[PDB]
Amino acid sequence: PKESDRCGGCGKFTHEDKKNDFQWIGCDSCQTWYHFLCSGLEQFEYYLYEKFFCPKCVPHTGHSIRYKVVAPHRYRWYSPNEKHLGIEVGSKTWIEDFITRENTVPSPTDDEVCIVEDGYEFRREFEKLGGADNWGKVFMVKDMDGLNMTMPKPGFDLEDVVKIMGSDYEVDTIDVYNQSTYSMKLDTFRKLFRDTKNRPLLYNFLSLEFSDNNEMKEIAKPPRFVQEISMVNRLWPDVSGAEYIKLLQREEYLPEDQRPKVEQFCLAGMAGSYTDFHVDFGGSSVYYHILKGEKIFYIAAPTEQNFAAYQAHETSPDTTTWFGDIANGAVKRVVIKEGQTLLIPAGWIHAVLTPVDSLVFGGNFLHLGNLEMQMRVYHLENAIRKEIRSEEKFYFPNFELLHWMYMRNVLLEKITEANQEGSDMREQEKNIWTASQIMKAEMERWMDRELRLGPEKNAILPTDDKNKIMISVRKQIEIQTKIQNAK
Amino acid sequence: KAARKSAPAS
Amino acid sequence: ARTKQT
Ligand SMILES: O=C(O)CNC(=O)C(=O)O
Ligand SMILES: [Fe+2]
Ligand SMILES: [Zn+2]
Ligand SMILES: [Zn+2]
């Protein structure tokens, strides 16, 4: 091929292959082409420079010249043809103003959020309301004592993180004023973060999942209660020696690379960060602890009125209206300060402002208590995905697969036992019974869809295996309903 | 746009 | 910046 189309480099035509993609960038000086990953740039930089300005040119050309902030109220702030368009949520201009008027949104009712003093108090109130089977309101815990939730010692901060994880460790970072996501080196984030005076752009990452880092995963953990109801945890138990061998002996082993990795996240944001309204993926519940700084959550109850508002807001092309202004006073304000812990069940629609440089440890989880709401949110996601194109990474990893395995490995067992024994399940296993009915109904839909128009890409679960699971499920459910026409 | 918790599968 | 995709 032509030599002007050779990196770079790398001195190759094709880059072996985070991912370079088949992506390139040309020097506006030496005019040669580089693979993106041979350019020296990090993904968050790909759109920043009008001029670039490779390594072989900088000591004599100067550092790359970045676009002029021509329109700070647009996501494309660098674009002149957008100077005249409206103010977008939450661009630099929008946030700037919002920081001053934001305090007018109402506090929540006691029916929506329950603020307790510590983990012990939480437990009481929690049980009062039916525990996790009947978990519908968010809780804010002013002190973590009594939650049995491992957290590092304060004074612990961003530095220890980039040291434990490594400085080259890349993480999906939100370019705030641009309301987009790009990979950034932990070390590169630390630099920008530590420069408190010069922040031409703001960054906030929420997606540093460390469950797989032998050090980190030991330093910050979910509350005991979260672990006890986590469906992911139940399917991929942290087990060893004979327990693990047994797990293998029963065909109950699942690969670690199939595990939804979402229960252990570190988050860090620059002052001024705003994350726009969303529901957490898969309708997952959240634990969220402030190690440093402060967050302001703007929240709305998982009602059908609110969902319908949210779905329309999410599918409309409008970009200039805060969802709070169309929500008919559904949005409430809750401030979370250093050392305080938020616990959000399935459904809650929320946005968050970061008043102050921050560091947080949190995680997402699925539990049977919120099965129905979890499926409701899944329907909400899928309906939005029909109108708007998004990346699967912003959705719950292996949602369906998880449910396929939970039925096969957990539920399918219990039902069969009762069917062999007595045994009407509504006696000490009612919760289990209803969970099954719900799970199967949704699963029959997936099976239906899969059958009406084909399976996804290659893997993971073959159609015939889903059916064989289903065949088994229908039988035992069919069989159990009978038992429920005597007892 | 695309500014939300991100968690590849995997 | 002038980019490209193959
Ligand atoms: O911290 C932020 O900017 C946003 N985080 C969330 O919305 C969450 O963890 O559920
Ligand atoms: Fe969230
Ligand atoms: Zn190259
Ligand atoms: Zn050059």
Side-chain angles (χ1 to χ4, degrees), chain A residues 27 29-32 34 53-54 56-57:
Chain A
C27 192
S29 194
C30 81
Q31 321 304 330
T32 64
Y34 288 86
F53 280 29
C54 88
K56 274 82 271 175
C57 290

Side-chain angles (χ1 to χ4, degrees), chain A residues 108 113 138 277 297-301 330-334 348-351:
Chain A
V113 330
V138 333
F277 298 90
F297 275 64
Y298 312 103
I299 69 180
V331 184
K332 314 304 180 65
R333 193 188 102 125
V334 15
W348 290 79
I349 304 162
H350 59 285

Side-chain angles (χ1 to χ4, degrees), chain A residues 41 53 101 125 130 135 148 190 283 285 328 355 397 416 449 477:
Chain A
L41 299 179
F53 280 29
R101 86 181 143 97
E125 286 308 303
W135 182 20
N148 292 315
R190 192 191 56 197
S285 296
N328 192 28
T416 307
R449 167 202 84 241
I477 276 165

Side-chain angles (χ1 to χ4, degrees), chain A residues 42-45 47-48 66 75 77 89-92 95 170-186 188-190 192-193 199-208 265-278 280-281 288 295 350-354 358 391 393-394, chain B residues 1-7:
Chain A
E42 301 177 44
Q43 196 190 26
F44 76 100
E45 284 177 296
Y47 87 88
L48 300 172
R66 51 189 297 171
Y75 302 136
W77 43 268
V89 193
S91 51
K92 174 154 167 42
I95 285 152
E170 278 182 356
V171 67
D172 268 347
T173 301
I174 286 164
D175 178 340
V176 169
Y177 297 151
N178 186 56
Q179 287 293 305
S180 290
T181 289
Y182 306 107
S183 258
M184 187 183 279
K185 259 87 146 297
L186 216 31
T188 303
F189 182 83
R190 192 191 56 197
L192 298 179
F193 191 88
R199 285 170 178 176
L201 250 18
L202 299 175
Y203 301 89
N204 185 13
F205 65 76
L206 322 161
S207 316
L208 165 42
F265 277 112
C266 178
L267 308 77
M270 287 172 190
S273 283
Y274 172 78
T275 304
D276 208 2
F277 298 90
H278 62 275
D280 273 24
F281 47 34
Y288 189 103
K295 294 289 188 174
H350 59 285
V352 13
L353 183 66
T354 331
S358 275
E391 300 161 69
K393 67 179 177 167
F394 303 110
Chain B
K1 317 165 44 180
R4 212 169 276 188
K5 249 197 198 99
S6 156

Side-chain angles (χ1 to χ4, degrees), chain A residues 7-12 15 24 34-38:
Chain A
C7 190
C10 186
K12 303 200 175 181
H15 195 289
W24 300 74
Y34 288 86
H35 284 134
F36 262 131
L37 311 188
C38 308

